[PDB]
Amino acid sequence: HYPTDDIKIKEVKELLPPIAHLYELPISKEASGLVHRTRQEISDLVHGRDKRLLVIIGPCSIHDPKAALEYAERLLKLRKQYENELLIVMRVYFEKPRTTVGWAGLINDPHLDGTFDINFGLRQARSLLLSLNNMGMPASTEFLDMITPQYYADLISWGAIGARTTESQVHRELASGLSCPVGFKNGTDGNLKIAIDAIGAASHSHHFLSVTKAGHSAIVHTGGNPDCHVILRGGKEPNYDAEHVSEAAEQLRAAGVTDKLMIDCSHANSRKDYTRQMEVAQDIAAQLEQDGGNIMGVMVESHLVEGRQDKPEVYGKSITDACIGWGATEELLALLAGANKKRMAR
Amino acid sequence: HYPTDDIKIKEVKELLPPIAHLYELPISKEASGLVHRTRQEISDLVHGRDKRLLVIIGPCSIHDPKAALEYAERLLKLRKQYENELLIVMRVYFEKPRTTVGWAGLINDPHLDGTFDINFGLRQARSLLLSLNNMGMPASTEFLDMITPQYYADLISWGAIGARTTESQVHRELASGLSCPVGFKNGTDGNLKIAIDAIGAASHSHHFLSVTKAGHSAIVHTGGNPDCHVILRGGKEPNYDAEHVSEAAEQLRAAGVTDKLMIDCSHANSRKDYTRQMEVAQDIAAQLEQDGGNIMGVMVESHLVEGRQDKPEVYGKSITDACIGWGATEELLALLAGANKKRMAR
Amino acid sequence: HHYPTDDIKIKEVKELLPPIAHLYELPISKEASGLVHRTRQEISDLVHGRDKRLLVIIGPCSIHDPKAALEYAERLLKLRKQYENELLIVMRVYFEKPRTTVGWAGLINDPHLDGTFDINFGLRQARSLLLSLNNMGMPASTEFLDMITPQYYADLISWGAIGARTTESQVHRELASGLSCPVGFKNGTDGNLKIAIDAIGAASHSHHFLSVTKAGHSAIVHTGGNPDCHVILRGGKEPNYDAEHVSEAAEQLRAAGVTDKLMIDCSHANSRKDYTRQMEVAQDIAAQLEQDGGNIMGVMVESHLVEGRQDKPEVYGKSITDACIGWGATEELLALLAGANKKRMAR
């Protein structure tokens, strides 16, 4: 009898089911209110019912809950100060996808040492998200697979599907059943069609495989997600300017989906240079002042301390993509608030 | 207390676990032998140790197990006839990914009527795959998600990751733990870099989330898959010709991965016209006759009857992509066997 | 230096297929469902004195061969019909007999009779037999020895037992309080009736106990109570089947405020462990029914195709646990009881 099963598998270990984490860390009344309200506020921006600017802002990746919470406390002050112009939500992404081998993020490898203590990672991720919502700071994340959402999607006010997965049938099927609004990034080399197609597909009912809250293999039947939109993040060339926004809007209208979109100030739009995020933001600010009718949001990579480092040595500094520091964040947010204040006069 | 969980979910239904199907349909001694041997024979092609041509050939999708088994019976005679020149493996794909709403395939919706009887669909797919191996025909399939392989990957001799998922981090993590060799298709518009990158990534150990054979949420730690290769399937223009093969081989060598590749005669290489598959095969044959050192395999969409139909009215005729019929299949295989006989004799 | 403290004396823990895997392959039919539902109600009617037919739980000590069980049931079915106005005949379908010294663990635990313990196959085979019996028109009965097996096949059971060794057990009484079927509690090994009277009372109330869901996951079960429990007299140090003993049991049952209708086992300790004495017990019960017998609602008999017992399964239709009466004796015993109860019912 020749072996055919699990030939290239080192180990398959049981995980605690979602319901174990939900039992220890139930969503509170106040967190559930914030999540509910923020999802609705964001849908209003997606569909042009309100003209505040969504701002998804925070670290490239979370590697230290302490720093994240300090960041959120500073950010909360500005979320409140600018609440008539901006809808500020913290970027709480646990991993950056990789081609070359490297750190698998705070959920998969919380101890930053290759031990892959995923039960601890998921618990810590849920704990941080609950703490954020409890302090008044809504959270956003990218969903990389079809199982992690069951552990903490209830605490997420906006979700992303990344460039590497926007075209994936199963990730679009996932998006169609996510409780939050969902942004789809354009493709790595700039392809907008995959994102426009994703919004259309995610609006419909689908089935996909995942687990129950009790941790058992399941088929999920979704209702469709009416609150999806594109995220422009460059690729071919940066696509943040008025010309590119106009062309994307045209193509969105041709497909019969929302022509309100988000612009990422970082990644391929900054050309991996954190010092250009302000320049992109300045360009968007000028669009918002002149007209900017198709913009509903921006994304910004921001941390306590600017730049990046290979090892987690400096407190509050990214170990993935380089981020603007806190002082520059204050400036960038003041810029956008002032420009959108003007746009809202119309 | 505001609701925040499963807001856009119609139903979450626990499935029978893999162990239930494996009890009803254990892999036989004969089927285990065939799978084990075929996986090794393919590894030998991927790594240039044998110069037979792998031929992945069969329906675009399986919608009728009766027709599939009939097809396999005919194909088996040619698998045997050409065993010194070609390694013939049946294409056994249960679904074609969609953008616009349509049939979800024989696993998800086996009754072709929107009932989504997935417990029946998984049973039936396993049964067909066991029957195929038991008759002496190895099987191949595309893995669209991270859970289905637990139900039947033990019966699969060669696996594919399609154009829409080659770039996906989690689908590369999956491939790194698949027991079979894996082909990665180039991107929808022709992007080969994603597939080259994929082979590299898939050769390493990774972690991803799935279920145990008992159906429980799990973390999977893989060993890496040394037997991955790219599949040329066209883009904006076809990419089957010697010039494209030569450049792909140089890029594969530049990345330090295998420079032996597979060419799809169908999909974008046929410009979506089943009558052009033979012309692609004729070009491949000329390449093999002249040199063709970088070719290890071909893919062909073939069925009992040529063409396609919207409803399953005609027996043995595709309801997804149009396929060549049985007579043409005999001719195309004869063509490839003859050309490769000459390549092998050098 | 973590010292080991978990599973120190465990050779292996293996996953079982969940109940729902067996239910998927072998769903209860519409016919079987009807028979189970009506037979349970018919038995309730006997327990509560609303009908004077005699329940007869009859068949092998233990099932070790499905073929012989189905042949047995075909023969018995003819008599179930013939005597339907006097007797309510249900086949005894017990897969195991409990042991103190090591021996065969029964057809569910060790279906292949060779210590391989292929329990997935054993449970499937048990469910298949029970479904086949109900489909042919023969209702089935069984003894429940643990709190998990009922999820696999209790839906096919018309009458359940809790044995002498478990009647006093808190958890087995909790189980009984949630079983869909009527339940008989055997008196204790040495004759103790009090534990069975107490069990009927306890089992009538709502309880909670641990088990598994149909999907096979650890679970707490909250029951509604079982109003259809009764005692089973099966002897002790002395047999307890005679009129004096039945009259005493009924006084104690009424004193406790629970049903004073009971079942009498013709086998085991009432037969003094001798299969050739079952008829004597049945003849004493016949005489009670003719004279009065108002407190008897049923009897239990160990019966097979072929009389006696054997130490290896060589003779087709012959017990490998307790010796049983053969088929010809089974015809005689049932004829005897039907005649006697016809007279009781006419009064």
Added chain:
Amino acid sequence: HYPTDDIKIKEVKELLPPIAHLYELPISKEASGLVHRTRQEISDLVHGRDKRLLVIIGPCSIHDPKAALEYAERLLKLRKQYENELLIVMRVYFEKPRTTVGWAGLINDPHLDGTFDINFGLRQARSLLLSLNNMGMPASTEFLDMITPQYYADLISWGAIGARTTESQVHRELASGLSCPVGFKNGTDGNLKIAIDAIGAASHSHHFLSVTKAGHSAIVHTGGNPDCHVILRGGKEPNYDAEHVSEAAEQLRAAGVTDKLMIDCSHANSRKDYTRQMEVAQDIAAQLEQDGGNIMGVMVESHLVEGRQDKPEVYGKSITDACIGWGATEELLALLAGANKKRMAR
């Protein structure tokens, strides 16, 4: 279709699996050492290698973890003081079995209000047991079913099977795979044969049904438990005296099993008068001074405050069987330590 399934069931609710509790409350290195060594120490008493007296002492039932921990802190001082004569282990029983309807114990109904919050119950039981072991106090309990051991038996140094279940085949099968030594109580009316038979059965390998640590329906194959003994707890008349011990010992030797036994001072030996436990203990002390070679242990129902109460009003006072209070406990342990010192000196 007539209904036949779960006719008389109000609800079936899935529990958190053992792995969830094990994650929150892993056994510590120190606790694992205490458990491991205490089990071996008790095995030594069972097999007559050591002549210390095992003392299983504590509340009839635990209804308040705070009182239990306070009790343990006081008892630990005496465990240490008398460690050369007595092996003191705390009685940590969560439930007393009932015939008439009443409180189902701290695991099944921790809130003492009929809410049956068993997930909270199991967590709290495990938490108390871990705390006890961590402070240096080993714990003992009675196992009433075949599932609860999966949640906390790793923390138990000695286990009991009670009078109502000693004869049960499945409870004997359970005992045959318990990691701790096990005492079997004589039957309600005094029957010793069921406990002698239980020791023999439990020494052998058995199979029984339960759940895996992940909570899945399982078959358990045991190795046999060589460390079982009887517990004399009275019958129609008490059975603690020299004459009864002598007779039980003769029957044990006749059966070929250990003739070292435990005597319960409470229950049907005190005839449910807590003030008689000291009288039983005095008789046992006299046996130990004179010969007492078959006695390996005693059991005593003891709490902070003597007596019992129907509602949990007074702190540290039983709501199940009446117990001796702390002062009487000090006296009883001093008495037994002195008497066994003389026994061991022979």
